[PDB]
Design a protein around this ligand. Structure first.
Ligand SMILES: Cc1ncc(C[n+]2c([C@@H](O)CCC(=O)O)sc(CCOP(=O)(O)OP(=O)(O)O)c2C)c(N)n1
Ligand SMILES: Cc1ncc(C[n+]2c([C@@H](O)CCC(=O)O)sc(CCOP(=O)(O)OP(=O)(O)O)c2C)c(N)n1
Ligand SMILES: [Mn+2]
Ligand SMILES: [Mn+2]
Lengths: 556, 556
């Protein structure tokens, strides 16, 4: 009888099904059409509920939660442009693997394409970017609950990685007292309601087989390239490469400890590239490599075989080498393909990597962003985690710093968007509960400025450094044309962030030297709150310092 | 030979082609892959260039420019999530007709689906929301320039309304001095380069035929409903309805002068609905009707025929009446279906509407958001324009105020998103150069907070009233459940906007009474800058006042 009650029973089946697939966090934005989903979620004690008013930030909050927790994270939004705002986080998850379950409320079919307020065409609106897309039908008791739970169980059970779009039409009325409408329909699932497993268990595993010629290849002159992986995987790859005697080029995202640091500099030296020409195999673990010199060496190298091991699917070599694309958990893969103790074969590169780091150390004193990046390993919070933003900061840390093995690093380096970094950092913090150091640029902080609202609730100290070099100074590193550079690339906004911090009652510091920065750090780590530290630096110093160091090391 | 030079020549054809279709404004966000487009645009003297760092706000800036100018407006963004951020504005334009030409830079095909940084699947990513989608090929001189301009000219020439997605792949190198690569290729267009017309002129017009039985139907008891239309159309509709002797129900978006004001209240009176039951025809001009009582009456009425006249395509009656859907410019349509003077047939409704307005005047004194809406006519800038935000404000002005005939009103009422109102207002102001009053709620201002950067550049005074009732109090008007209302619907953020204004060096006032508000306006209109006026009100007073007035008027 009651449409409002049955809507809520239909939604309750959806939300309960998700709990059987490890969904603990759910991120909710406000609306009316989403009422069946939101009330079902609110009443379900299995969830940790997060809220936000900007649906783009909400999606990135979920992305950060999923990024750290490695579990699917659910999102509820109302119909209309609220749904469209989820696209950035969904795209990023498609590239880096976070499992975002998007429950997007919709108008019913009779209110689409007829000029109805806040009604748009939602099925298929994210095109190929979700891993799975479910377009639910208009709720009716004539479709059994077992169909509804089975379709959700199929999508979640077979989800290797990436987002699921579940479009959820509901017709009005949405409000009213709940009666027993739909209760007997739910009860057809029997004691599934008291169970802890899916209704339909469908969870095939996707994994490459053991490489039967690994004992042959591990005796060749190999190179190990370490991209984005877990903190524990970084430590395991470091030990494996060291045992093989193969040089390890470790990305900032790898947590390997970077035994040959400043690769972005020493890969610019022809003697290093000449030595690497002797490599017969390159084994890359992880992907989304950061530095320009590494991407160029990767594109130019011609080993007999190039292997990429990673748990994300599809091609990951943008240079299309002859070789292998091996889908596996990296730690499992190393156990299936163990190292053999062998004599290291590289002689020149260890020399160059040491000289390169010494060159950077020689320039450590200036109060600039390149120096902050180089020294950042000295400021990492104990038992904490680093969230590195995009543009210059990730490149400068990668090029100039040596991060410790196993120290967790998080980032959005699939599509490398500057649109969701503060809200992602908030989710990264909330997921692990660890003290967090987050570093972003000024345009990045402006882009996601209203996510400072989220950072009013952190469970451990979060230090947000905003490097303010007055524009996107990556475009002073790139060879952009000087005449159009300021207006059409750098886009300086000529702001500071003291008022943004004050708006959201967040502590703020603008340190003018290292002593004041260290004082700010010391105070910030003492309370479970977010502290904003604005480092104001001369626009082009960081880019020019990197260029100068590249040149210096290339001439060694 | 030079890929970078040919990239720019290819892009120059695209951008020059757009100038032949009335594109004057172009909105550019920063990036590297977009270099060929951005440099072609920068060099082209036809354009007015706008820049912004948030691509979601950039899309809405373009939306506002197109909304007022009634011209196509171009947008350039780089590849990746920058493109996804255009979705909200594109969706809104699909509903209300703005012609947004989205030039989205892309990686070339060889760098898609291979783990390349900032490379995603872009063709089709906006699904059915663009009116036209062009997926351009990898640039090559083996495709003649005449094909490229012809494809642009087909898309722009045949564009009745809505957005065009032009996906634009470019391979590196993107930078370098331009040599003569591609010059002879461009010169195959001959003196088109000095022409002011398209290469291919394809501009079929879409229009319904005049209704030959109008002279029969105009003799019947009709009702005129006026939705969103131009300011001049509003004046023409008002005169036409008065001549017909038909009651005119005029939306806040109609600029008819609302001769039967407070329809949202008096439509709740059974004497009014009983009288309207005599109507044999309803002629609605414009669409996106605002008020709940009007939407409910429209849904319930049963005239023999229901007509909707508007220049936007497709069904516009969410109640699916038997009748006619006539695609036309409203002013042209009225010339083809003229009024002849006839005695008015309604006697009770004019009395009720006056009584309803009297009931509102009786409550004008309290310093609340309902009263601000009721009195907003008193604060409209001379020779200016109003941009009305979404949620309570548009509903309160519609229900409680009588806006002047022909005074321009602008809004985002297709999907009614709260995600782009400040950036849209910025474009509305820049397009016409008029002094602008923009009114939004607090969650709305937070959602698009960084668009305050744009409001640092307006060509005439813009007053941005932020009504701060601490949350989305539309959910105190809707019958949301009390237990979950605050956390999962209202979502109060407990902020003020004084620091936001200071961050962007915008004048700010927080008036405490009507006298201070009038003083604030007197100050604000003096200079071509944006003033933020924050009106702090008690959470639920606006919603309850509307509810009380509805009840009072229903009993007259
Ligand atoms: C949503 C979106 N839209 C536009 C872009 C283009 N884009 C970039 C990509 O080119 C580089 C990404 C990367 O690979 O790291 S970096 C950048 C400027 C950032 O300015 P900043 O925060 O002040 O930092 P700084 O440059 O160090 O001073 C832009 C605007 C984007 N990525 N995402
Ligand atoms: C992008 C997006 N996401 C969520 C919503 C849902 N939504 C609304 C639809 O009801 C507004 C359509 C309409 O006006 O008809 S109104 C609203 C709260 C606005 O709060 P406010 O600014 O403080 O104003 P107040 O309520 O007057 O206090 C929300 C959250 C949306 N529309 N767009
Ligand atoms: Mn910057
Ligand atoms: Mn509000």
């Amino acid at each position: 009888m009651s449409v409002s009650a049955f809507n809520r029973r239909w939604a309750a089946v959806i939300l309960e099904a998700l709990t059987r697939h490890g969904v603990r966090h759910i991120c909710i934005a406000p609306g009316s059409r989403s009422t069946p989903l939101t009330l079902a979620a609110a009443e379900n004690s299995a969830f940790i509920h997060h809220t936000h008013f900007d649906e783009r930030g909400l999606g990135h909050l979920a992305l950060g939660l999923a990024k750290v927790s490695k579990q699917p994270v659910a999102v509820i939004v109302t119909s209309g442009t609220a749904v469209a705002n989820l696209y950035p986080a969904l795209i990023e998850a498609g590239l880096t693997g976070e499992k975002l379950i998007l429950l997007t409320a919709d108008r019913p079919p009779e209110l689409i394409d007829c000029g109805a307020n806040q009604a748009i065409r939602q099925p298929g609106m994210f095109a190929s970017h979700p891993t799975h897309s479910i377009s639910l039908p208009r709720p009716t008791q004539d479709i059994p609950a077992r169909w509804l739970v089975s379709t959700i169980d199929h999508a979640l059970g077979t989800l290797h990685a990436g987002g699921v779009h579940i479009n959820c039409p509901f017709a009005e009325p949405l409000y009213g007292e709940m009666d027993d409408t739909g209760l007997s329909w739910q009860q057809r699932l029997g004691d599934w309601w008291q169970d802890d497993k899916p209704w339909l268990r469908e969870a095939p595993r996707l994994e490459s087989e053991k490489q039967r010629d690994w004992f042959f290849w591990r005796q060749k002159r190999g190179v190990v390239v370490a991209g984005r992986m877990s903190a524990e995987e970084g430590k395991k790859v470091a030990l494996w490469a060291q045992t093989l005697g193969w040089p390890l080029i470790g990305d900032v995202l790898s947590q390997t400890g970077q035994p040959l640091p400043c690769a972005d500099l020493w890969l610019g030296n022809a003697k290093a590239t000449s030595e690497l020409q002797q490599a017969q195999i390159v084994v890359q673990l992880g992907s989304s490599l950061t530095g320009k010199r590494l991407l160029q060496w990767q594109a130019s190298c011609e080993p007999e075989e190039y292997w990429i091991v990673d748990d994300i699917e599809g091609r990951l070599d943008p240079a299309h080498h002859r070789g292998r694309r091996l889908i596996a958990n990296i730690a499992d893969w190393l156990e299936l393909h163990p190292a053999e103790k062998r004599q290291p074969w590289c002689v020149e590169i260890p020399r160059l990597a040491e000289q390169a780091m010494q060159a950077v150390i020689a320039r450590r004193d200036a109060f600039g962003e390149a120096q902050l990046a180089h020294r950042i390993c000295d400021y990492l919070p104990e038992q904490g985690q680093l969230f590195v933003g995009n543009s210059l900061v990730v490149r400068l840390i990668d090029a100039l710093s040596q991060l410790p093995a196993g120290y967790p690093v998080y980032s959005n380096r699939g599509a490398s968007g500057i649109d969701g970094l503060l809200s992602t950092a908030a989710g990264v913090q909330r997921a692990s509960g660890k003290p967090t150091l987050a570093i972003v640029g000024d345009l990045s902080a402006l882009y996601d400025l209203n996510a400072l609202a989220l950072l009013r609730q952190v469970s451990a100290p979060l230090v947000l450094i905003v490097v303010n070099n007055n524009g996107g100074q990556i475009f002073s590193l790139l060879p952009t044309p000087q005449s159009e550079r300021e207006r059409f690339y750098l886009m300086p906004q000529n702001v500071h962030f003291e008022h943004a911090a004050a708006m959201f009652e967040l502590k703020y510091h603008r340190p003018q030297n290292w002593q004041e920065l260290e004082t700010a750090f010391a105070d910030a780590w003492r309370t479970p709150t977010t502290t904003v530290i604005e480092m104001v630096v001369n626009d082009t110093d960081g880019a020019q310092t990197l260029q100068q160091l590249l040149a210096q090391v290339s001439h060694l």
